[PDB]
Amino acid sequence: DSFVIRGDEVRQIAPGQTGKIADYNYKLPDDFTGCVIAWNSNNLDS
Amino acid sequence: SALGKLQDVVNQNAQALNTLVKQLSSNFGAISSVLNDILSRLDPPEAEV
């Protein structure tokens, strides 16, 4: 699952988190088994 | 007390059942003994704990 997010609240991609992204955009289940990978893309997207 | 051998059976069964009910008021370390009261304020990921 690939998407672009901003550092503020980017931590919300995790099991059992609350906020605009976790509640309205992308919510992971409580028993999620996998990895979350992130990197700064300022040179490409800004 | 002449009939104590028969009265003691009633008293022991009532006392064991009474203690069994009273154990529901204990917390065992949880924030509250009422399951609905903890479930209504804490989020699922911690409410399960």
Swiss-Prot record, chain A:
Quaternary structure (record): Binds to host ACE2. RBD also interacts with the N-linked glycan on 'Asn-90' of ACE2. Cleavage of S generates a polybasic C-terminal sequence on S1 that binds to host Neuropilin-1 (NRP1) and Neuropilin-2 (NRP2) receptors. Interacts with host integrin alpha-5/beta-1 (ITGA5:ITGB1) and with ACE2 in complex with integrin alpha-5/beta-1 (ITGA5:ITGB1). May interact via cytoplasmic c-terminus with M protein. May interact (via N-terminus) with host bilirubin and biliverdin, thereby preventing antibody binding to the SARS-CoV-2 spike NTD via an allosteric mechanism.
UniProt function note: Attaches the virion to the cell membrane by interacting with host receptor, initiating the infection. The major receptor is host ACE2. When S2/S2' has been cleaved, binding to the receptor triggers direct fusion at the cell membrane. When S2/S2' has not been cleaved, binding to the receptor results in internalization of the virus by endocytosis using host TFRC and GRM2 and leading to fusion of the virion membrane with the host endosomal membrane. Alternatively, may use NRP1/NRP2 and integrin as entry receptors.
Protein name (database record): Spike protein S1
Organism name: Severe acute respiratory syndrome coronavirus 2 (2019-nCoV)
Region annotated Integrin-binding motif, chain positions: 6-8
Domain of life: Viruses
Effect the entry attributes to changing residue 11 to S: In strain: Omicron/BA.2, Omicron/BA.2.12.1, Omicron/BA.2.75, Omicron/BA.4, Omicron/BA.5, Omicron/BQ.1.1, Omicron/XBB.1.5, Omicron/EG.5.1
Organism lineage: Viruses, Riboviria, Orthornavirae, Pisuviricota, Pisoniviricetes
Residue numbers of the full-length protein present here: 398 to 443 of 1273
